[PDB]
Amino acid sequence: VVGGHPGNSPWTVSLRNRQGQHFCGGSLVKEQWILTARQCFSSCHMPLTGYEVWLGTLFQNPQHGEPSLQRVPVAKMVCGPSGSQLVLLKLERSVTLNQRVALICLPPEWYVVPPGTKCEIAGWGETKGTGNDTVLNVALLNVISNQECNIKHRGRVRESEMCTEGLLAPVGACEGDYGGPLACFTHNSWVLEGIIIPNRVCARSRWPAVFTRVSVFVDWIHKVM
């Protein structure tokens, strides 16, 4: 995350490859289910031998004896509908919920986050020289309407996508942050309204970020789970 600061986000998880390395983020939606981005995977039938999800630590590379660290093998991937840019990962085991590891709520089907809503992005991805890129960083964004977004994006943003306000300072989620959550605090709950996806340009001054809009796809998520 560029332009952010060290923080905690107990529903954000780290996806780990065969070499034990962080490659993408994810969002804890059920005790054994992680919602993430399709662009984190080479195919929908990717060989996921050796892949795990790590939870409960602020560090990208924690000491393996770390008390709050949970490490769970990936059981399987399920690709979302065409145009969703989503993947669900089932874990080989159900994680244990505590103060460091918490489920984020799913939105109601078709729900539109109102403009001006404040949301948080989080991840262990690149900071482009704006911070320590080996701890969890967070940034606060502000939702804008798709109509307002599509002025600068010239109509490219789909109904299946949502946007946040372009920031004057370079701020946003880039490489290694894909699949993590856009979490919005509304109606007395943190709710997973978006998933971080690749954009044409990342953390670019005055350019609105675009996320996949989770409320469009919640029928599929519930069905799969």
Partner: peptide, 4 residues
């Protein structure tokens, strides 16, 4: 869900 959704408590921090």
């Amino acid at each position: 869900c959704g408590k921090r």
